[PDB]
């Protein structure tokens, strides 16, 4: 998934509105939460 370039845009999708990104009005800057790497070691293991 990381080797294939597609899909990396979703991390920085918040850059769609530059003014909004600068203002930081919304805390949902992450793909799966507040920030992109909110939890990379415990959250992904919920699936069996």
């Amino acid at each position: 998934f990381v080797d294939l370039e597609t899909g990396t845009s979703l991390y920085f999708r918040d850059t769609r509105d530059s003014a909004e990104a600068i203002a930081h009005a919304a805390d949902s800057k992450g793909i799966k939460g507040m920030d992109n790497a909110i939890d990379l070691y415990n959250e992904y293991r919920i699936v069996p």
Binding site: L4, T6, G7, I31, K32, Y44
Partner: protein, 194 residues
């Protein structure tokens, strides 16, 4: 009013990826709910109608910020005033021109295909889900091919854009707008400006 505002804000700030598949006409609150989502997909049937003043009230929903974006005022001067006053409808093509949404799908029953794709996918890591979403967007929503600028549903064709920029842009008065419209009325059909 508070509940509609809160719903719009929640859709706007939803943490996990939310995609509003807009298929149909939208009023002020509907367009505020659709456009401000993190992911917004527009089909050929998309219709964003503010239509505030004709009902006797100011337009409500948050689309005024999108109309007043410097990008919008730069690409189509006077478009914000034209939409807020005349209550015109902005289409999927118009939103694509204005850069509000990057997703435009022509595939029927997209919801079933999305359900099947995300049932077939099996993982939960952030990079894996990001790749899956990106591949879906690229192969179904991103207009890489099989899309013509003539085949998109738009109402801001360049002649109409010039009309709007000549009749609404940089006119800080409704009375001045009315005077300009009245002056344009008496343009003969032989006039080059007409």
């Amino acid at each position: 009013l508070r509940q509609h505002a809160s719903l719009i804000w929640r859709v706007y700030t939803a943490p996990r990826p939310l995609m509003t598949l807009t298929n149909g006409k939208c009023r002020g609150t509907g367009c505020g709910l659709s456009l401000f989502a993190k992911y917004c997909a527009l089909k050929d049937s998309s219709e964003f109608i503010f239509d505030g003043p004709n009902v006797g009230i100011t337009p409500y929903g948050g689309m005024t910020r999108l109309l007043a974006r410097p990008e919008t005022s730069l690409k189509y001067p006077g478009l914000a005033e034209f939409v807020v006053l005349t209550g015109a409808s902005l289409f999927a093509g118009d939103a694509l021109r204005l850069g509000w949404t990057d997703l435009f799908t022509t595939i029927p029953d997209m919801t079933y295909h999305i359900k099947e794709w995300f049932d077939t996918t099996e993982h939960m890591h952030n990079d894996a889900v990001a790749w899956q979403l990106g591949h879906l967007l690229e192969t179904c929503f991103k207009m890489k091919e099989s899309h013509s600028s003539a085949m998109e549903r738009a109402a801001i064709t360049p002649t109409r854009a010039r009309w709007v920029e000549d009749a609404f842009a940089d006119q800080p008065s409704v009375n001045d707008i009315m005077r300009t419209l009245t002056e344009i009325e008496q343009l003969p059909f032989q006039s080059t400006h007409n």
